[PDB]
Design a protein around this nucleic acid. Sequence first.
RNA 1: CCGAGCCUGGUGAUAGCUGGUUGUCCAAGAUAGAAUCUUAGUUCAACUUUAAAUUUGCCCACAGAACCCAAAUCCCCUUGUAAAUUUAACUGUUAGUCCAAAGAGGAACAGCUCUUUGGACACUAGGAAAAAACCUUGUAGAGAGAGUAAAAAAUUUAACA
Lengths: 37, 94, 148, 120, 94, 99, 101, 86, 50, 177
Amino acid sequence: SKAVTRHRRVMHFQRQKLMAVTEYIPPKPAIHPSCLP
Amino acid sequence: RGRIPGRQWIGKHRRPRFVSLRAKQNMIRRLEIEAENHYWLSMPYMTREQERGHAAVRRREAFEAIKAAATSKFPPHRFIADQLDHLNVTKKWS
Amino acid sequence: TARGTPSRFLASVLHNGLGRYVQQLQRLSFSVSRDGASSRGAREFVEREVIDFARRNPGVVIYVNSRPCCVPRVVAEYLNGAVREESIHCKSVEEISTLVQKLADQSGLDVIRIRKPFHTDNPSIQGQWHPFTNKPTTFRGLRPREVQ
Amino acid sequence: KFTRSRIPEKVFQASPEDHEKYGGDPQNPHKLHIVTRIKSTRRRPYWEKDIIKMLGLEKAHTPQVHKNIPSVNAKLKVVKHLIRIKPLKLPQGLPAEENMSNTCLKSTGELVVQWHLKPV
Amino acid sequence: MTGKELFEMWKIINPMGLLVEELKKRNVSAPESRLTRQSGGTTALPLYFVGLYCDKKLIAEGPGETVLVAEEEAARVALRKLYGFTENRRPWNY
Amino acid sequence: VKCTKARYLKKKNMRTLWINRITAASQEHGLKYPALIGNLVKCQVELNRKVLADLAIYEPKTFKSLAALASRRRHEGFAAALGDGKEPEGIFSRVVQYH
Amino acid sequence: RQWKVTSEDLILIGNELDLACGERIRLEKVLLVGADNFTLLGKPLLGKDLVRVEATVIEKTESWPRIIMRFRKRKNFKKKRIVTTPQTVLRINSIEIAPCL
Amino acid sequence: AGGQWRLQQGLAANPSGYGPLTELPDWSYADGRPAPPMKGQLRRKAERETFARRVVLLSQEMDAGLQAWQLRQQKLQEEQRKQENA
Amino acid sequence: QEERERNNQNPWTFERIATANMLGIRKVLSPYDLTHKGKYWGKFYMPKRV
Amino acid sequence: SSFSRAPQQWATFARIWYLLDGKMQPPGKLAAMASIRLQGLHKPVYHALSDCGDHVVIMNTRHIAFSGNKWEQKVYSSHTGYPGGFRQVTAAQLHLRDPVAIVKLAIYGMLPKNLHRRTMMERLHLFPDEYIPEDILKNLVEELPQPRKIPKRLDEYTQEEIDAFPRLWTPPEDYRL
RNA sequence: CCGAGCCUGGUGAUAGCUGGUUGUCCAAGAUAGAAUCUUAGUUCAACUUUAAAUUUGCCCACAGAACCCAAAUCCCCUUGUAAAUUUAACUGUUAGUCCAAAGAGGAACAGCUCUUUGGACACUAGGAAAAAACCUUGUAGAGAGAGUAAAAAAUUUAACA
Ligand SMILES: [Mg+2]
Ligand SMILES: [Mg+2]
Ligand SMILES: [Mg+2]
Ligand SMILES: [Mg+2]
Ligand SMILES: [Mg+2]
Ligand SMILES: [Mg+2]
Ligand SMILES: [Mg+2]
Ligand SMILES: [Mg+2]
Ligand SMILES: [Mg+2]
Ligand SMILES: [Mg+2]
Ligand SMILES: [Mg+2]
Ligand SMILES: [Mg+2]
Ligand SMILES: [Mg+2]
Ligand SMILES: [Mg+2]
Ligand SMILES: [Zn+2]
């Protein structure tokens, strides 16, 4: 198939592993900023 | 019920594979040792011009050894001993 | 093949290692021909090495027939009565020597599949495991859910 | 399409945090790379596989030595994803001719010239 | 002699009586037999562990199909222990 | 061909059988196989799985000793996780260095 | 490979040791040793002076003929070979422990 | 199992790799005589000594190349001296 | 988007991995990915992706 | 040891009668441990050819408890053999009609799919209530513990525990409650 | 059993087409294209093979390679390695499938078709459920030794002054 598709083109497994490793991990303190501060 | 069109792993529709923390740990390990490799590849010891002409003698002499091994090739030597040892098949006690 | 072949448990005859060791090979009988290029190796072997072989191994006995034979043979009898017949037809002297030496070192019992590569006379120390070794007892020996 | 991948030179620029982490002095840098092949040669381009055969890494988990110089670091960069790399560092000076036989490696990249094979 | 145990060669009858005789020779009380463990009493495969206790002191335990068999076995164990032919004994020195 | 390719299967089957036996013995002592193996290794004892199973069968007391050692090493490792350094190392966690 | 052994017990190995029959040898490596009420295991192996394991050689023999046959499908690939691996049989005569500890 | 721990300690990941469990002799004469080395130990010693020879060669080649560069640069300096003297 | 890609705790980003070619993934990837690092996949657009 | 060969062999390969009370436990966990004991894995002499299994008894299977809405949503399906004979029933009504089927088939699924499965299932025993025939509650060995603990209710929590537990917040007095 | 009889002989008719092709063991070894009343084949080339002569072969470091209107590539001393060219003799392959990427046709359909770089398969083994093409992994044996490789998806959803 083509690169550009109407549907979401299923990706290679290594590609999906990489995208599953790469995410935005939100930096939060150990304490929630509402109850304590 | 629950079948897949065509082959299970190819085409416009295939079986959806999913990732596991097992594989995630595996690949993070591989890429972190690869970052170690990057670090150790950095900070070279010598410069291009410093390491330019040090191994020329070794490369040359190795190649002439290869050349000599190639040139020195002939049929083996033939011997009367090897020829006549075949007569000892008709050995027998007197 | 294992299922096609019979099997046995590893064992030594008369526990040869504990007391004095004795070579379990008893007798050898060589069948060679004066003529015949096939027996040239055997003739040269009885010339050179069989003397030294006998000197090295006094307990064994050796017989040589030296008769007309198209194929030279070697027969080995053991204390068990086990017989081993090998054809040395057109065979070299050093390999005949290796054959004879491994025959002498060989034990008088058929070479077949060994079920397990060891054998213990009394494998149990500290007591064999039974289901009740690793669980406690009950006061007055009472089963679960019984009054008296 | 798929072709040989060029690497930007900035990737190989250690940072102070990298130095503090890996314990590698940018000054007086090590001389020799211990190298091992960790990844399979298959499912890789012909150039990568013949380059590891060039280095002599057809055998896996077999530590082999090279120099830390640009002409070699280029090939090591080409096949960096397939290999473990570490430096060579020894306390006991270069192996002397008398101690050629009783040498030994260590998992830490160390090369001991004496190997008494007994505990302290 | 190595392999085979005692009662394979030297069979006996009335091991309990023989044991009581030996204990009266060694000047100790008459021990009592008590099933220490039980399983499948009603089952076709009864299983008993019977111990022999003197003066509230155990000498031997014996497993068995039935109570009588387990008692005979415990007596055999105690006899082996007394006569020194335990399987865990010092081997023969050559 | 099946006789050839049954060899590796024999190896794997017997390994898994030793695994199962050791797991059972450890479970009836209150431990489990991964903990046991890791603790023994970091206590510097190389007893392969077959001798482990043979010892579990024929010598349960020695296996109880080994399981106790393993559990004590688990507890020492937990104490170390609580305090990484700044503490006296475990008596059994101590190691021997060769040269 | 490991073994669990005692006195008066046989053992097989699948290689040649370069020993004549009747020879006695002292086995060095021991992972542990156990008596009825105690056992002794090293880190990893025990000291030389502590134990003395002695074994006699009894037999040198080729193993039974084992097949190695390779075969592939619908492409005329089949390949046979026979092997007779050598074997040596040992017997542990006795085991002793020293007071040094 | 425990390979990462063995590496943390400095040991081989697989105990069969190196150490006393494998490098010591597996048998000796009952009379106390030393047994001949095993073939595995022989070939491992051979590999190790070739490894050391190669390391020495590589190191001293690098050193000689560096010294040659130093000498060539010093020559460069003195020949500039010669030029301006001319 | 920019403060998220600045403050993310994951040390590993498609930018770094692709520009490095640390796992030979340059074959499964495209040359377009070097600029379409993670955000794009064909015509689609993953704004949460970073 | 110092035991005779036949008594030792009998004692070693003997069977054991385990008992379990399934009151307020999950049938999955119960079936896990029961399948272990039936296969005989817990015995360090395990081997599939050697029928080293053990007999197991369950009580109070009527008082079994799942986690989640499984009673309502999980479905057991079976086909009689006739056309249209395919029918389904939730665990709830299947329990109402037969209280033991659930755990017995759970163990049937846990166990391997060999021919020994049926024999081990026959060695197995199940009882909806804590009532047992004389033979079967006599020929026992040991009652192994339960996997999970049961949380206590307010009528079970003694007063001293409540007093030790601190109150948390001040309610305003003006409140209907 | 006549779109033109049956018997014999030429006749072992010819068949680019189908089928079949007998003992054991080892090694190297799937490869761009051109012309053809030619595309079910064949000749040359390319690849592969054997024996010999010789020496450079491969990776490649700066520099270098267009106006018009991106990944990379050619050349390339060093370096790390040991192959390469040439000579003499043939044979066989020359109807190819998926995946990743750049594209074209088609519907931004196809397990679709057509070109290019790479990989795998048509060679063994483990895994994704069984699976050709996906992921780990190659040089071959005996073992009742051991350390690892890739390797098991998580998700539940909407009140309002
Ligand atoms: Mg495409
Ligand atoms: Mg299908
Ligand atoms: Mg007609
Ligand atoms: Mg006609
Ligand atoms: Mg024809
Ligand atoms: Mg055909
Ligand atoms: Mg080949
Ligand atoms: Mg044609
Ligand atoms: Mg060049
Ligand atoms: Mg076609
Ligand atoms: Mg197609
Ligand atoms: Mg297609
Ligand atoms: Mg083909
Ligand atoms: Mg190999
Ligand atoms: Zn709060």
